[PDB]
Each structure stands twice: as C-alpha cells, then as structure tokens.
Amino acid sequence: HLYDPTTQYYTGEYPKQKQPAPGVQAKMTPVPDCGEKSYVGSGRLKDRKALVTGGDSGIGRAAAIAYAREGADVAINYLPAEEEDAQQVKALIEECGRKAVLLPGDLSDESFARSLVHKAREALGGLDILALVAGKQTAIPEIKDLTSEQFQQTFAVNVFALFWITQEAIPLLPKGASIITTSSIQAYQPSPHLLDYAATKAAILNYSRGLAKQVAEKGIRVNIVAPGPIWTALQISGGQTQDKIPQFGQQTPMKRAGQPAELAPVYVYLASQESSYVTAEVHGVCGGEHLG
Amino acid sequence: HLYDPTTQYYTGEYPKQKQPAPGVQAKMTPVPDCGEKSYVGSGRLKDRKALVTGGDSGIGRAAAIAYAREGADVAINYLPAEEEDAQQVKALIEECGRKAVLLPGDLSDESFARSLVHKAREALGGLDILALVAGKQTAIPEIKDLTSEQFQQTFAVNVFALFWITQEAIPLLPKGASIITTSSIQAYQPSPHLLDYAATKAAILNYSRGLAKQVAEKGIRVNIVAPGPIWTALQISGGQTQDKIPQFGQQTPMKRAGQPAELAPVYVYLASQESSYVTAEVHGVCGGEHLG
Amino acid sequence: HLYDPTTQYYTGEYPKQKQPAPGVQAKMTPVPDCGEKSYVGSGRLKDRKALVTGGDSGIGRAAAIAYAREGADVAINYLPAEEEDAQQVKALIEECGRKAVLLPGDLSDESFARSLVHKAREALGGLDILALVAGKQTAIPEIKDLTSEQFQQTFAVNVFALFWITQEAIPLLPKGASIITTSSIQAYQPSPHLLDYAATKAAILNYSRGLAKQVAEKGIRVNIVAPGPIWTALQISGGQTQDKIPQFGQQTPMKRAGQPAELAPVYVYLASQESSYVTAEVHGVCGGEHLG
Amino acid sequence: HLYDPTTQYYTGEYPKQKQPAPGVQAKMTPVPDCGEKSYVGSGRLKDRKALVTGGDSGIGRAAAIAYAREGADVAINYLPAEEEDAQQVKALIEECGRKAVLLPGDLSDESFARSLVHKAREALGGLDILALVAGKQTAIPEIKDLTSEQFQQTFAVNVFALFWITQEAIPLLPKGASIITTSSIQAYQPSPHLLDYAATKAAILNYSRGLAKQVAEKGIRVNIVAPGPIWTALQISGGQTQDKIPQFGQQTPMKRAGQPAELAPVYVYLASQESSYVTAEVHGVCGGEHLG
Ligand SMILES: NC(=O)c1ccc[n+]([C@@H]2O[C@H](COP(=O)([O-])OP(=O)(O)OC[C@H]3O[C@@H](n4cnc5c(N)ncnc54)[C@H](O)[C@@H]3O)[C@@H](O)[C@H]2O)c1
Ligand SMILES: NC(=O)c1ccc[n+]([C@@H]2O[C@H](COP(=O)([O-])OP(=O)(O)OC[C@H]3O[C@@H](n4cnc5c(N)ncnc54)[C@H](O)[C@@H]3O)[C@@H](O)[C@H]2O)c1
Ligand SMILES: NC(=O)c1ccc[n+]([C@@H]2O[C@H](COP(=O)([O-])OP(=O)(O)OC[C@H]3O[C@@H](n4cnc5c(N)ncnc54)[C@H](O)[C@@H]3O)[C@@H](O)[C@H]2O)c1
Ligand SMILES: NC(=O)c1ccc[n+]([C@@H]2O[C@H](COP(=O)([O-])OP(=O)(O)OC[C@H]3O[C@@H](n4cnc5c(N)ncnc54)[C@H](O)[C@@H]3O)[C@@H](O)[C@H]2O)c1
Ligand SMILES: [Mg+2]
Ligand SMILES: [Mg+2]
Ligand SMILES: [Mg+2]
Ligand SMILES: [Mg+2]
C-alpha cells in the first residue's frame, strides 16, 4: 500500500493568518499535523528519558509524540503563552502510557535555560535524549529595520541557549545518550529577509559538529536536523512575511510544504541507539530543496 | 539498556590481509558484521519489493538483510566470484520468511545492467525500492600508476551503471517508490590515493540530487547514503593500501571503523514511506568524520 | 570611477538562437564579451607558459586573453569547426605582444588529449599554467531521452580528458606550476535537465581537490573555478533548452547573466604565484547564485 | 622565476610562546610576514577608500598594506592596546603615498562599532571598501571550562559587530562598494577546542551571503575570505592551546602554515571592481585544507 508522497499531506494554498509570536498552533488553519493520528512506535526508545525544547508545537511536538510512542518518558519546555498546546502534548504522551513533564520558561533567561536540564532529569528520573528544537524566527526584509534587540534575542534563543543547555547536560549524560539539534535549509541558503535567523541556523549546525567531536569520547552523540519549509506556528507568527504564506512550500520539488509529522522519523533514528555510527551529521527534510 | 557507541563494535587493530577484488567477506578477519544476528524489523517495508546491488556483502548486504527483516522481498546483484557470500544472503532473506532472488552479473556491461531491472521486476512481481550499493574502489597513491582502463572502469561501475539502472527503472516505478544511492565521505574529502573513486562518489551524489528533482513529480524519491570508514571487503581487496588497514577507522572521532550493520537503519529510513518529505538528501554515517 | 556591477554588463533579455554544438561565438547575438577591450595586465604572469582548453571562445577565451595580457605565452585547444573564433584569439594574444599557438583537436580522443600537453610544451618552450575549460553540455529534460552515447561523451570531454591531460602533464610541470579546472554552480545545485553534465561538474571539482593533495609535494597547485550563468556558445548550442534563453541569468541576485570577461580575474589570481597558499579550493563567479 | 609555494615560507616548528590577548605581533618569535617587503600594487584600487578592522596586525594588516599599495586610502581599526603594531601600519600606508587613518576602539561596544563607519568615511572623504577582519578566538578544550562571558564576547566581536558595522554602512555605501568579511576553515571543519569561535565563523559566512542577496540591488557586493592556519598573534594570545603551537600548520597538504602576506591577493581581488560578478562567495586560503 504505497502512497504518493507529493499528495500525502495538504497541498492547497494556506489561508493568510497571523498570530503574535510564538503562536498557538491549535489556532492555525489548518492545524499542523504532528503525527498525533499516524505515528506508530516499535519500542526503539524503550525506557529512554527525553527533554524536548519547543515540545508544545510544530517539529518539537512531533518529536515528543514519537518519542513517547517509541517508549520514552518526555519532558517538554515551551513558553507560558503556549500552555494550551503543551497540555495537548501532555495528554498525547500520557496516552502512550508514558510520563509527561511540563517545564515552561523562557530560554533567553540563562539561569532558566541552565536550570532546565536539572529540573527535567530530577522529574524524569534520568536523562538520555535531548532534542533541542525551540527557535525564534522573525522576517525583516530590509536591514535598516532589523534592530539590535531582535538580532541579539534571536542569537540568545537559538545559539546561546543551545550552549547553556548542552554545557549543563554533558556532565550528566550517560554513555549512549543522544543530542539532536535543529538547523535549517537557511544554514546553506540564507534568505535576505532572515539575516539574523539564518546566521543562527548556521551557528547551530557548526556548534553541534564541534560539540560532537568533543564529546564522542564520553559516548555521547550529537547530530543535527535541518528542515525545509514546514507548516508551523513559527511561520505564521512573524517567521514569514504575510504575502509568502499562501504558496508556502510550493517552490520545493515536491510542490508542497512539509508537515511536522514528517520530521519525527529522523528525530527517532538519531535518538535511537541504531544510529551508533552517526555523530556530527546533518539530516535534511526539505521536500527536495536540498542541503549543501 | 544503553551502550557506549564507541565500544559497541570491533575496536582492535585489523590484521593486514589482502584478497583479489571484489573479495569474499567470509575470508576476512574479522568478518564484517552486517546485522545478521542483531537487526530486528517492525514491518516498515511490508510487502515492498527491493533490488540491492552489492547485496552479497558489506553495506549492500546489511541493507538487503534489513529490508527482508522489515518485510520486503529482495533481489540482489553481485559478481559471480561472490556466489558464496550471495548464498549466505539468500538464506538470510529466506529465514525472514521473504523471497530472495539472486541475479549475478557485471554492472559494467551496459546490456546486463539495463536487463537487471527487468529481471528483478519479473522475479519479484514488481519493484519499488532500489538500493544501489555496488562499487569499485582501487587505491593508487601516484597518478603515474593510475591507468586509463582503471579510471574508466571505476566510472562504469559506479556512475554509468547508476544511470543505466535508474533510466530503465523510472518508467516502471510506482508512486511511492524509493531509490537510495551510495556516495562516501570521499565525495567531500577526496583522498589523494583515490582520484577516480572519490570523483565517482561526488558524481553519484550530484546525479542523485538532479534525478530526485526530475522524478519528484512522478512520486519517486531519490536519496543518498555517504558512509565513512566501514570495515568491508572493498577495503581489503585493493580499496586501501595495505599499511592503512591496521588503523583503519581509528582517526574518526569515535576511534573505530563502522560495521555494515550500522548502515542498515538509514537505508530502511529512506526506503520507508516514513521519509515522505525527504528527497535529494545525503545522509552521513561516518563516526564523526562528517560530511560537508 | 566606481561602477554599479548590476548594470556594468547587459541586463536585458536574449533572443532565442540555436547553433549546432559547439557553436561559433562570432555568430551569437549578442557576441559574448571576453574582455577584449577591457582587460589590463600588470605582468602577474610574465613569461609564464599556458595551455588553455576551450581557449577559442567563452570563459576559456577570457582566460587566454587575460593570460596574454598578464605576460604569458598561450597555447589554445578547441575543435576545428571553431577555427574562426580561434583565429580571433590568436590575433588578441599577439596584440598583447605574446606568442599564440593554436592546437585544434577533439579531447574525447585519448591519444589527442595526451599528445596536446607535449605539443603545447614543445611549441611554447615550457609549460607552467594549465587552464582546463573545455566542456560539453546538453540539456535533456526527461531521462528517457538521455542516451548512453551522450552520457558517456559528456564524461569523456569533461572528466576523462581532464584526467588524461593532467596525468600527462604532472611529470613535466615545474615547481610553481598552477592547474585551474572548471566546475559550475551545477556541482552544488544540479538541474534536472542536466543529469550527466552536472554530475561531471561535481566529478571535476572532486578530482581537482584530490589531485591537489597528491601533487602538493611536487610544488604544483590545483584549483577550481565554478561559474554561474555566463552568456556563451555552450548555452545556445544545446546547453540550455530554448525556452530558458530569453531570461538567462535574470534569476541571480544581480539580475543578469555574467559575461566571460568577468571570469578572467579569478583565472589570473589562481595562475599567479600570488595564490601560493591556495590549493584544492573552488571559486564561485555566479552573480550571487552562490556555491556551497 | 617560478617558486615552489610549499617552501616559499617557513615550514618548521614554532616556539611555544604566549601573550595576553589580543597580542602584539611585533613581539612574536617570529613576527608574521604581512607582505611589507613583497606586495606590489598595480593600481587596482586607485583612489578607493577602505576601512579595515583588525588592520594593525595579521591578516587585516596584510589587507591594509596591499590596499594602500593598490592605490587606496586606508583607515584601520584595532584595539588601542595594539598601538605598537598599528603605528607600523600607518607608516606602511603612508610610504605608498596614501592617507592613513588610525581609529582604535573596542568593537564589542555597539556605540563605538556604529560610530566607526562614520568616522572613517569622514576622515577618508568617502568609503567604498570594508574589510572586516577583527576577531576574537580563545581555545578551550573542554566545555566545562567555556564561560558564558567568553561565549558571548566571541559572538559580540565576531558576529554582532559585523552586523552593527554593516547595518550602519549600507545606507552610505555607493554603487560599486565591496564588503569583505572573514570566516575560516573552522566554519566547515569546527575543532572541539573552538566551540564558540567556530560557530561565529559559520555565522559570519552565512550572514555575509544573506546580506549579499539583500544588497545586490544597491550595487554593493559582499564576499567572504576563509583562511586556514595562518601564523598570527591571534594564535599565540590564546587562540590555540600551547601544545598546538609547535606543529601549527604542518597538517595541511602544503605542510606549513600560511603567512598573512598570502591572504592579501584575495582581499584585493574581492575589493577590486574586477570581481563584478562575484557576490555571496567564500574564498579559501588554506594550504590545501580546503573548504566545502
Ligand atoms: N517550520 C519551518 O519551516 C522550519 C524550517 C527549518 C527549521 N525550523 C526549525 O524548527 C524549530 C521548531 O520550530 P517549528 O517550525 O516547529 O515552529 P513552532 O513554533 O511550533 O516551534 C518553535 C518553538 O520555539 C519555542 N520557543 C521560541 N522562543 C522561545 C523562548 N524564548 N523560550 C523557550 N521556547 C521558545 C516555542 O516553544 C515554540 O513552540 C525551530 O528551531 C526552527 O528554526 C523550522
Ligand atoms: N567500506 C567503506 O569504507 C565505504 C565508505 C564509503 C562508501 N562505501 C561504498 O559502499 C558501497 C558498498 O561497498 P562496501 O564497502 O560495502 O564493500 P563490499 O565489497 O562488501 O561491496 C561492494 C560490492 O560491489 C559489487 N560490485 C563491484 N564491482 C561490481 C561489478 N562490476 N558488477 C556488479 N557488482 C559489482 C560487489 O558485489 C561487492 O560486493 C560502495 O559503493 C562503496 O563506494 C564504502
Ligand atoms: N556558460 C555557463 O553558464 C557556464 C556555467 C558554469 C560552467 N561553465 C563551464 O565553462 C566552461 C567553458 O564553456 P563556456 O560556457 O565558456 O562555453 P564555450 O562554448 O565558449 O566553451 C566550451 C569550449 O569547449 C570546447 N570543447 C567542447 N567539446 C570539445 C571537445 N570534444 N574537444 C575539444 N574541445 C571541446 C570548445 O572548444 C568550446 O569552445 C565549460 O567547462 C562549462 O562547463 C559554463
Ligand atoms: N590566523 C589564523 O589561523 C586564522 C584562520 C582563519 C581565520 N582567521 C581570522 O583572521 C582574522 C584576523 O585574525 P589574525 O589571525 O590575522 O590575527 P590578529 O591577532 O593579527 O588579528 C585579529 C585582530 O582582531 C582585532 N580585534 C580583536 N578583538 C577586538 C575588539 N574587541 N575590538 C576591535 N578589534 C578587535 C585586533 O585588532 C587584532 O589585531 C580573524 O577574524 C580570525 O578569525 C585567522
Ligand atoms: Mg509553540
Ligand atoms: Mg562482495
Ligand atoms: Mg567555442
Ligand atoms: Mg593585533
């Protein structure tokens, strides 16, 4: 029973729609499909313990759902404004028979970002998967309109918090632990309206590779997922200009945007012990708008 | 039950050993682990129909085994000299309860290479996975010793046969079909003893991306796997100079070579319908000697 | 005296035109600008001795002209059907005060490709720059229409001849010699209508890097130039489909195609002893349609 | 005469030595060669007006010297603790018959970084080349020892100051202006002792490409230079561990480090109007330790 991947998910134009960042995905048209009805596990992460940032919505939610479906207990971080989305994820994790831990807070607060790993490990009784998916993205077509405050904040959420969290995690992660970070096609093909954001995506990719090299001897793997155009709240809450929303994703070879569901399998592959010889590698999921 | 990936597979030095190309893996010390005793499926390729070139040994064998474990019927191609290795794979596929088809023949013979798709499709009653893993690799440290015959033959097996097979397959492949080709870290970091070989690995990566773009509209995906140093018969039958064998793999961040078993999960991910938004992408499995 | 690079060269649309390959650039509308009236040398290649393949027209011609302007004697190879264009380059070289040598012949003939190096060295009294610019490019939008004959011929001209020439040259090249090969943006972003061609451009880039590593100890440097869309005979003699000619180049950030003249400065930089710490590197000239 | 580039500059081991950052290159053993006696101009930048950050020492010094030798007036920025180096550069610029402007100040201060562009333009009577070479680099082999203060300072100097300067410059730069930023091999091959630094080098590369796309229509070009191992004060004032100093550079295919002199030619190529079809491109100068 083979499906055509070009028509498997929504292929129509997206309604124009806007929300204040970071957005509530439950309010979108359509709501992003994060695999709630479709993802089926096979115990590839049995009794693993995961922290997922951005686990309330979008790609991080797809990873959180799949991780629970594969047998892991899951802590999610997200912003308080996203509590309604986070509560849906709590229910999805618990329905898998797993433990859900909800740890809201702002990753641009260094002390919060540092405390998070320890709170999650205590609540879960361990920690051996980190999926760092949270991100800020604000489209600004002309550099004269790009403020210092925005530029620095994008780096704080996307790069500095990645350092703060991983620095706290390394000493406590067991041999076999897996860290998955989140870059973008933008790391390779930066758009002129995402000067700060695309540069953070490049920094994430590079930092992840350097960290991988440094911690390989501790038995810890660090890998990167770089999605292409995925239908998510990040894109309707300022990540794209409003005029780009209707045809979002249609320029890819597959002629549609991805849904977050389609990211879960690679997050599972990388978390799983099956990817034992994989570290420092980036994985594209871009509808043919390929990395390189 | 978490394992340290750095110590999970062989970490000793490799004895010096040499066989005539293409080599018989059963004569190696150690014999490459292709997942015979470890790979467990979950129905991710149920009733799929795969052709795997190089399916007798090494990475292609690991893919063939995993595909059968995941529920697929499998045809393998290999050279007659490798019949003993291919017979072991026949048994492994049949022990999964699936159909095995052995189609020996030389891929540098265009008429044979083109016929292979038709033979596999007839035997299997269809065809919807192609894993193109066969390759020639001959180390020559100084260009004065690199013959035109060798250079051309490396391109025939690694590039021309990829074109011949894929051209024959495209008109027959159903929507949802998945093609997986095999590049190398050498495509990004070519070594001076592999002038022809590394250039073919770069050509494979590029051709696969172009093909992906061309066939996306037909619902066919084309992706690339690029391994790092993996212990296989290719490496002991002329792919490496003899002096490079004992320490093979030890320069990677993980400080060991990979085993073919470790490549099967990505070949399954890419064959599976789960990778619906993945086309034209390369996937590294290199022990931290990363692509880019 | 600063000019706007966006408007420095023609920014408008091109008329459809087709010539049989390889094309006569003197018959194009408009004729490509190869720097005939603009390039000014300063002795950076004084008394050097260059062989330039494809030196009759296009990018190779721009390199040949600039090399003579910088003080080098220059031998050009080209196909005999291109004699009109070659005779123009002969005059241009002589008008720089240097010696021109015209060595027509088909690089897909291995005997001729190998002899070329020796004929050029004998005629020039030495040889210490090789600019390998000749290429075949044939657009075929659907793989069903891509013949084995075309695929192999593309590899013969673009890859095998590069190997034949460089193998023949290495034993005779002095310390300080510089080899410059020619890839493309297509090596990174292959178009579905150029499956064979783009794969050769990737192979050239890779082979050049491996060769650079092998011959560094001999004091020889090997570097690569990867142009973007440049207005040339290759593009109107089958390299592009006719429908792609009118707006050729207009998709780049600079909104125009390049002219061959604009490639000369990087060919000079790489030939010159000034690039002493540069080997195995690729240099993009793409109007902002950047390489990786 | 033709020179062997592998032995053109020193090939042996370097004494261990340390200075407080940012170092004084005049006190190094040996002092880096920045082209003081070797670089000869030909008017390629006649009457151009350049600002060079890090213009006191190392690669920025080599660019500043070459720019003046090619006919440009040159303003240099540097930290005021570097006056011993900066004063030498003033003399070198003036000895070419050009105007020198010394504008010291710490680029991590946003107000200073923004003011710098205006002060330089006022002092020079215009501004049409920006070579942004300043950088902080601090080796820390283990993440436990990498402080937030260091991480953020490395991003302030290397990334935020690049944004501050370029944002301030764009509105005032004429058509034809050229911006050259400075990345590294580390952007592609990050080392585990340089987690923050290498990530900044990837961010610089990416931001530069995005900026180039945004400002192409304004007739401004933006390109990147990515050196390999170059003997400079950055390396002996904390950028490398002491144990990495003795064999610095010997791992490249050329088997030596570069000297800053060897970077000048690409900075001139990119500043010059000759590179009219070059924007968003990165240029490696790495002794064969090539970029992607
Ligand atoms: N959607 C795409 O097209 C796309 C493409 C490439 C990469 N990405 C990456 O995917 C990741 C997830 O985003 P998404 O697209 O799934 O959208 P999303 O909006 O569903 O997820 C982003 C999440 O970031 C978190 N976040 C933002 N700022 C935060 C802060 N200050 N503190 C704590 N959490 C914060 C929020 O919890 C939010 O749910 C991001 O890193 C993004 O860069 C997305
Ligand atoms: N082992 C490594 O370190 C490594 C690294 C990167 C990529 N690879 C790639 O992995 C692929 C598989 O090789 P492997 O390392 O598993 O070793 P292997 O020797 O087990 O597999 C190579 C197979 O190629 C097939 N082959 C060779 N010439 C053929 C011909 N003329 N006709 C038909 N079949 C032919 C043989 O059947 C052989 O089993 C190759 O494409 C190789 O480039 C290997
Ligand atoms: N024009 C572009 O948009 C573009 C873009 C990227 C790369 N390139 C590369 O530029 C190089 C030069 O081509 P160009 O665009 O300047 O066009 P061109 O037509 O002016 O040059 C190509 C030359 O190739 C030579 N050639 C072809 N087949 C040959 C054979 N069998 N034997 C001997 N010589 C042969 C011909 O002499 C011809 O002049 C090619 O390698 C091409 O791949 C061009
Ligand atoms: N030397 C190498 O191996 C190497 C390799 C790749 C890239 N680079 C890059 O080359 C560039 C120049 O460094 P270099 O190696 O020539 O050494 P260098 O020490 O001679 O130059 C670095 C300069 O940075 C400037 N700088 C540092 N912090 C500053 C601040 N807070 N405010 C103002 N100026 C500041 C100083 O003026 C200093 O001279 C850097 O951007 C570095 O990342 C160097
Ligand atoms: Mg959210
Ligand atoms: Mg075999
Ligand atoms: Mg011609
Ligand atoms: Mg200094």
Q: Is the CB of B227 under 6 A from ligand 2?
A: yes
Q: What residues contact A149, with CB distance under 8 A and at least 6 apart?
A: none
Please give the Cα distance from C79 to D278 (Å, whole number).
30
Q: Are A221 and A278 in contact (CB under 8 A)?
A: yes
Selected catalytic residue, list A9, A197, A207, A267: A197
Residues of chain C with Cβ-Cβ distance to B205 below 8 Å are 202
- Return the closest-CA partner of residue B77 out of B41, B109, B47: B109
Query: Cα dist. C44→A13, B252, C55, C188, C283 in Å?
Result: 57, 42, 19, 31, 19
Q: Are C233 and C58 in contact (CB under 8 A)?
A: yes
Q: Are C58 and C230 in contact (CB under 8 A)?
A: yes
Q: Are A228 and A286 in contact (CB under 8 A)?
A: yes
Q: Which residues line ligand 4 (CB under 6 A)?
A: D 22-23, 25, 54, 56-60, 78-79, 82, 106-108, 133-137, 157, 182, 184, 227, 229-230, 232-235, 260
The helix/strand/coil state of C139 is: coil
Summarize chain C as % helix, strand, coil (round to 5): 45, 10, 45
Q: How far is the CA of C22 from the centre of ligand 3 (A)?
A: 8
* Gaps in chain C after residue (C–N beyond 2.5 Å): none
Chain D contact for B188 (CB, 8 A cutoff): yes
Chain D contact for C269 (CB, 8 A cutoff): yes
Determine whether B130 is exposed, middle or buried from the number of CB atoms within 10 Å of its CB (0-12, 13-18, 19+): buried
State the structure-solving technique: X-ray
The helix/strand/coil state of C265 is: helix
Q: Are D205 and D180 in contact (CB under 8 A)?
A: no
Q: Which residue has the tokens 């003249």?
A: C261
Q: Which residue has the tokens 């900075």?
A: D267
Please give the Cα distance from C120 to D255 (Å, whole number).
32
**CB-nearest partner of C210 from B198, B203, B207:** B198
Chain D residue with the nearest C-alpha to that of A209: D190
Q: What residues contact A122, with CB distance under 8 A and at least 6 apart?
A: none
- Return the closest-CA partner of residue D113 out of A151, C98, A230: A151
Q: Are D128 and D98 in contact (CB under 8 A)?
A: no
Query: Cα dist. B166→B51, B170, B172, D173, D179 in Å?
Result: 11, 6, 10, 51, 45
Chain A contact for D70 (CB, 8 A cutoff): no
- Return the closest-CA partner of residue B161 out of B216, B116, B104: B116
B118: containing domain: 1-292
Residues of chain D with Cβ-Cβ distance to C229 below 8 Å are none
Residues of chain D with Cβ-Cβ distance to B188 below 8 Å are 292
Total tally of structural domains belonging to chain D? 1
Our CA-based measurement puts residue C190 at a distance from the nearest CA of chain D, in whole angstroms, of: 16
Tokens in use for C8? 């420095």
Please give the Cα distance from B82 to A278 (Å, whole number).
29
- Residue D148, annotated ligand binder? no
Distance of CA D291 to the CA centre of its chain: 17
Q: Are D132 and D201 in contact (CB under 8 A)?
A: no
Q: What angle do CA C36, D215, A190 make, to 5 degrees?
A: 105
Tokens in use for B211? 């093909």
Q: What residues contact D109, with CB distance under 8 A and at least 6 apart?
A: none
Q: Are D134 and D157 in contact (CB under 8 A)?
A: yes
- Return the closest-CA partner of residue A136 out of A194, A202, A94: A194
Q: What residues contact D98, with CB distance under 8 A and at least 6 apart?
A: D68, D71, D72, D73, D74
Q: Is the dihedral of CA C148, C153, C158, C163 positive or negative?
A: positive
Query: Cα dist. B212→B54, C189, C260 in Å?
Result: 22, 12, 31
Helical (H) or strand (E) element with B202:
helix B195-215
Please give the Cα distance from B8 to B159 (Å, whole number).
34
Please give the Cα distance from B143 to C211 (Å, whole number).
8
Please give the Cα distance from D260 to C1 (Å, whole number).
30
Please give the Cα distance from D143 to A212 (Å, whole number).
11
What atom of ligand 3 comes closest to residue C237's alpha carbon? Answer: 19
Inter-chain touch A176–B5, beta carbons under 8 Å: yes
Count of Cβ atoms closer than 10 Å to residue C90 Cβ: 19
Q: Are D48 and D71 in contact (CB under 8 A)?
A: yes
Chain B residue with the nearest C-alpha to that of A276: B5
Selected catalytic residue, list B9, B14, B197, B267: B197
The helix/strand/coil state of C17 is: coil
Q: How far is the CA of B31 from the centre of ligand 6 (A)?
A: 12
Tokens in use for B237? 């039958």
Please give the Cα distance from C40 to C197 (Å, whole number).
33
D74 forms bridges with which residues in the sheet?
D50, D100
Tokens in use for B70? 């995941």
The helix/strand/coil state of D108 is: coil
Give all strands of the β-sheet with B129-132 in edge-to-edge order. Answer: B100-102, B73-77, B49-53, B129-132, B178-182, B221-227, B282-285
Q: Are D4 and C176 in contact (CB under 8 A)?
A: yes
> For a pocket test of ligand 1, which of A9, A132, A234 has the largest count of ligand atoms closer than 8 A to its C-beta?
A234
Q: Which residue has the tokens 């509560």?
A: A87
Residues of chain A with Cβ-Cβ distance to B5 below 8 Å are 175-176, 219, 221, 273, 276-277, 279
Helical (H) or strand (E) element with A204:
helix A195-215
> Does the annotation mark A267 as catalytic?
no
Q: Is the CB of B285 under 6 A from ligand 2?
A: no
Q: Are D160 and D114 in contact (CB under 8 A)?
A: no
Chain B contact for D286 (CB, 8 A cutoff): no
Please give the Cα distance from A106 to A116 (Å, whole number).
10
Query: Cα dist. C112→A260, C106, C121, C165 in Å?
Result: 56, 7, 14, 10
> What CATH number has the domain bearing residue D80?
3.40.50.720
Q: Are A187 and A144 in contact (CB under 8 A)?
A: no
Please give the Cα distance from B82 to A117 (Å, whole number).
52
Residues of chain A with Cβ-Cβ distance to D144 below 8 Å are 167, 170-171
Inter-chain touch C202–B200, beta carbons under 8 Å: no
B72-90 residues labelled b (16+ CB within 10 A) or e (exposed):
bbbbbbbbeebeebbebbb
Inter-chain touch B284–A278, beta carbons under 8 Å: yes
- Residue A56, annotated ligand binder? yes
Query: Would you state the torsion angle of the CA atoms of residues A146, A147, A149, A154, taken in this order, to the nearest 10 degrees?
Result: 10
Q: What residues contact D63, with CB distance under 8 A and at least 6 apart?
A: D52, D55, D131, D133, D180, D263, D264, D267, D268
Q: Are D69 and D98 in contact (CB under 8 A)?
A: no
Chain A residue with the nearest C-alpha to that of C191: A253
Determine whether A199 is exposed, middle or buried from the number of CB atoms within 10 Å of its CB (0-12, 13-18, 19+): buried
- Residue C210, annotated ligand binder? no
Helices (H), D71-215: 83-95, 110-124, 148-155, 161-169, 195-215
Q: What angle do CA D222, D225, D226 make, to 5 degrees?
A: 140
Q: Are D227 and D184 in contact (CB under 8 A)?
A: yes
Q: Is the CB of B233 under 6 A from ligand 2?
A: yes
Please give the Cα distance from D244 to C176 (Å, whole number).
29
Chain A contact for D72 (CB, 8 A cutoff): no
Helices (H), B13-130: 58-69, 83-95, 110-124
What atom of ligand 3 comes closest to residue C56's alpha carbon? Answer: 39
Q: Which residues surround ligand 8, an ion (CB under 5 A)?
A: D 22, 56-57, 82
Q: Nearest 5°: phi and psi at D115?
A: -65, -35
Tokens in use for B85? 């290795």
Max Cα-Cα span within chain A: 53
Count of Cβ atoms closer than 10 Å to residue C246 Cβ: 12
Q: Are B114 and B168 in contact (CB under 8 A)?
A: yes
Q: Nearest 5°: phi and psi at B204?
A: -65, -45
Please give the Cα distance from B43 to B71 (Å, whole number).
5
Please report the DSSP string for C33-87 in residue order: --STTT----STTTT-EEEEETTTSHHHHHHHHHHHHTT-EEEEE--GGGHHHHH
Please give the Cα distance from B139 to A190 (Å, whole number).
39
Please give the Cα distance from A182 to B79 (Å, whole number).
42
**Touching chains, A (3+ CB pairs < 8 A):** B, C, D
Please give the Cα distance from C57 to C64 (Å, whole number).
9
**CB-nearest partner of D254 from C6, C216, C286:** C216
Q: Is the CB of A32 under 6 A from ligand 1?
A: no
- Return the closest-CA partner of residue D261 out of D3, D13, D38, D95: D38
A187: left (phi over 0), alpha (psi -120 to 50) or beta: alpha
The helix/strand/coil state of A290 is: coil
Tokens in use for A33? 């499909």
Count how many pairs of residues, chain B against chain D, have C-beta atoms within 8 Å: 4
Q: How many residues does chain D have?
A: 292
- Return the closest-CA partner of residue C100 out of C51, C39, C166, C168: C51
Residue of the CA atom closest to atom 26 of ligand 4: D134
Q: Are D267 and D180 in contact (CB under 8 A)?
A: yes
Please give the Cα distance from A235 to A136 (Å, whole number).
10
Q: Which residue has the tokens 């597959």?
A: A254
Determine whether D169 is exposed, middle or buried from the number of CB atoms within 10 Å of its CB (0-12, 13-18, 19+): buried
Helical (H) or strand (E) element with D268:
helix D264-271
- Residue D117, annotated ligand binder? no
CA atoms within 13 A on the CB side of C108: 13
Strands C221-227 and C178-182: parallel
Q: Return the ligand number nearest the Cα of C284.
A: 3
Inter-chain touch B202–C206, beta carbons under 8 Å: yes
